[PDB]
Amino acid sequence: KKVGLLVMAYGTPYKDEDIERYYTDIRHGHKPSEEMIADLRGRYHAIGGLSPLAKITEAQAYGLEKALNDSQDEVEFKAYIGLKHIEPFIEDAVEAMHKDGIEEAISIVLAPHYSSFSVEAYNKRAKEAADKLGGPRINAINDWYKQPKFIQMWADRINETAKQIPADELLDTVLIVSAHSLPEKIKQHNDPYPNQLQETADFIFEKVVVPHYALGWQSEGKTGEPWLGPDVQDLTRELYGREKYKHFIYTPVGFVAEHLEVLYDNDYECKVVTDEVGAAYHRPPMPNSDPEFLEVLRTVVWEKYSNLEH
Ligand SMILES: [K+]
Ligand SMILES: [K+]
């Protein structure tokens, strides 16, 4: 039988007309105000609109499927995309697998780090759907930031971007390593997410020419509670105040695609700050569906299959 490959991600609106229902789902059924929707529409317009965004997630899932099936002849994987906040939902993907007669699946989230707040939610939804249908059995991957090829992918991109920088200003350059912020309360649960981001930054930093680095958070939601900090905008201001860096290199390694959180929260909002302090802004290409990144994911999934079967 084919092995199911459940590739999960947050979801992005396909059409402009989807923005309201998308953000209503994100906000637990609380429809965004007219002013909030207008703000969000303006942010999507700033980054060139919606059409490029969903294509990346598709290219990652199906590129991963092809990378797996061309690299070995023990099994055939079939990819099913399951999204948190728009169709096809996680539950749709699991239903599809069961209807197709898939008995065994491996799941992976398109984010390198584990949190009890975020990744566990995907896993719980997938498992509960499967339990209701009677299958498939789902063997979940929880994180994959420790993969050497993942770290090397980011180090290589940073080192290439660093060639943009005059030799004598490299000592005035800082690497800002970031991920999506989460509610600060995850720390009361001993959530490993903050430590996993620190480890990722450490592993990358020892492989790059940039001599200074800092960890930050971004893209925090608006709920009634504090979120992990510092936010990259505030951290940029603070680091300039203390050290007067001339170059900021932003690697939002918690993200895998050029979606709104990178094209707006970094390329607009962080560049506003670097502009305001007279420093230069740099941000390497995101992984998207680059063959090097597809090979990272292939390595992750095949290592999981191998551990289960070999
Ligand atoms: K678990
Ligand atoms: K914090």
Residue numbers in the entry: 3 to 312
Reproduce, without paraphrasing, sentences from the article in which this PDB structure was first reported:
CpfCs are members of class II chelatases, which are ATP-independent monomeric or dimeric enzymes.
Structures were solved with molecular replacement using BsCpfC, the structurally best studied representative from Firmicutes ferrochelatases, as a search model, and refined to Rfree values of 0.2013 (apo-LmCpfC) and 0.2014 (coproheme-LmCpfC); for complete data collection and refinement statistics, please see Table 1. In the apo-structure, the substrate/product binding site is occupied by solvent molecules (phosphates and glycerols). Interestingly, the orientation of Glu263 is notably different compared to the product bound, pointing away from the His182. In the apo-protein, the active site (i.e., coproporphyrin III binding site) is filled with solvent molecules that are released upon binding of the macrocycle as seen in the crystal structures of apo-LmCpfC and coproheme-LmCpfC. In the apo-structure, the side chain of Ser53 is solvent exposed, while in the product-bound form, it points to the inner core of the protein, due to the interaction with p4. Similarly, Arg45 (H-bond to p6) adopts a notably different conformation in the apo-structure compared to the coproheme-bound structure, even though it is hydrogen bonded to Asp41 in both cases. The H-bonding pattern changes from one H-bond in the apo-form to a bidentate binding to the guanidinium group in the holo form. CAVER calculations of the putative substrate channels in apo- and coproheme-LmCpfC show that the throughput (throughput values range from 0 to 1; the higher the value, the greater the importance of the tunnel) for the two calculated main channels in the apo-structure is higher than for the coproheme structure (apo: 0.867 and 0.799; coproheme: 0.832 and 0.757). Additionally, the bottleneck radii for channels in apo-LmCpfC are larger (2.6 and 2.3 Å) than in coproheme-LmCpfC (2.2 and 2.0 Å).
